Design a protein around this motif. Structure first.
Motif, short mmCIF file in Angstrom:
data_model
loop_
_atom_site.label_atom_id
_atom_site.label_comp_id
_atom_site.label_asym_id
_atom_site.label_seq_id
_atom_site.Cartn_x
_atom_site.Cartn_y
_atom_site.Cartn_z
N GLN B 5 29.91 51.10 31.73
CA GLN B 5 30.30 49.68 31.49
C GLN B 5 29.19 48.76 32.01
O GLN B 5 28.79 47.85 31.28
N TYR B 18 26.33 41.12 36.16
CA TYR B 18 27.82 41.18 36.24
C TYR B 18 28.21 41.45 37.69
O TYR B 18 27.64 42.36 38.30
N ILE B 20 31.70 42.10 40.30
CA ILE B 20 33.16 42.38 40.30
C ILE B 20 33.72 42.11 41.70
O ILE B 20 33.14 42.62 42.67
N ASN B 22 37.12 42.22 44.39
CA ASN B 22 38.44 42.81 44.77
C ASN B 22 39.34 41.67 45.27
O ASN B 22 38.84 40.56 45.51
N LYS B 29 30.96 46.26 42.30
CA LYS B 29 29.63 46.58 41.71
C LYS B 29 28.93 45.30 41.26
O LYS B 29 29.61 44.42 40.69
N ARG B 30 27.61 45.23 41.45
CA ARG B 30 26.80 44.06 41.01
C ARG B 30 25.57 44.57 40.25
O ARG B 30 25.22 45.76 40.42
N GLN B 86 39.77 37.66 35.07
CA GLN B 86 40.48 38.44 36.08
C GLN B 86 41.37 39.52 35.43
O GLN B 86 42.22 39.17 34.63
N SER B 87 41.15 40.78 35.80
CA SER B 87 41.95 41.92 35.29
C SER B 87 42.66 42.56 36.49
O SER B 87 41.95 42.96 37.43
N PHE B 90 41.31 42.60 40.21
CA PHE B 90 39.83 42.45 40.23
C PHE B 90 39.39 41.33 39.28
O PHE B 90 39.78 41.33 38.10
N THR B 91 38.56 40.42 39.80
CA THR B 91 37.99 39.28 39.03
C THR B 91 36.46 39.40 39.09
O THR B 91 35.94 39.61 40.20
N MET B 92 35.77 39.24 37.95
CA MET B 92 34.29 39.40 37.95
C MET B 92 33.60 38.15 37.39
O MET B 92 34.26 37.39 36.66
#
Lengths: 50, 128
Positions: B5, B18, B20, B22, B29-30, B86-87, B90-92
């Motif tokens: 991804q 990108y 992410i 918590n 991850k960045r 936001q899923s 987790f929001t990215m």
């Protein structure tokens, strides 16, 4: 996937661009003009003096 | 699988990085191009304050029942774009650029490559 969907919509057209932004009119026709600033004339002279 | 991804996000045109976040605010991850962890710690704090304030404001300040923000996109100066999705918990944050910005980036990359080639040539000359 959701982030990717957002990327595609924005990529299609910039949407913030301004056609001919900043640059001015540039060449613009100008008419030549003449302006009398003042007139100097003699007063009560015999006949007229050129 | 999860690694793909991040590679896919880079593959999309106009995408810089990108990040992410918590629920706690730790950055999962960045992207490598963007600063890793130090930028993520600074980006996660700002997005959480913005996302939490916006989520809270829509429900009470706008006086609309059961209304929740789904995506926030902030367009700033130059090519910066920061879509936030936001899923679950987790929001990215995704940073993408415009066509002109992408072209400029490509030009910069080309210039860097040219500089590297010049350095290699200089090294070869020194060796000779």
């Amino acid at each position: 996937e959701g982030v990717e969907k957002c990327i595609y919509q924005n990529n299609q057209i910039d949407l913030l661009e301004e056609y001919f932004e900043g640059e001015t009119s540039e060449h613009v026709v100008e008419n030549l003009s003449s302006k009398t600033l003042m007139l100097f004339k003699d007063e009560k002279e015999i006949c007229k003096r050129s | 699988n999860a690694d793909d991804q991040l590679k896919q996000l880079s593959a999309l045109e106009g995408a810089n990085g990108y990040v992410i976040f918590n629920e706690s605010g730790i950055p999962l991850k960045r992207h490598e191009k963007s600063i890793s962890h130090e930028k993520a710690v600074h980006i996660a704090a700002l997005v959480s304050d913005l996302w939490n304030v916006s989520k809270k404001v829509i429900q009470r300040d706008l006086k609309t029942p059961e209304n929740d923000i789904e995506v926030i996109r902030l367009r700033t100066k130059h090519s910066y774009e920061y879509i936030i999705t936001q899923s679950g918990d987790f929001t990215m944050l995704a940073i993408q650029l415009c066509g002109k910005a992408i072209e400029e980036a490509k030009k910069a990359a080309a210039a860097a490559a040219a500089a590297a080639v010049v350095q290699e040539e200089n090294k070869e000359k020194e060796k000779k």
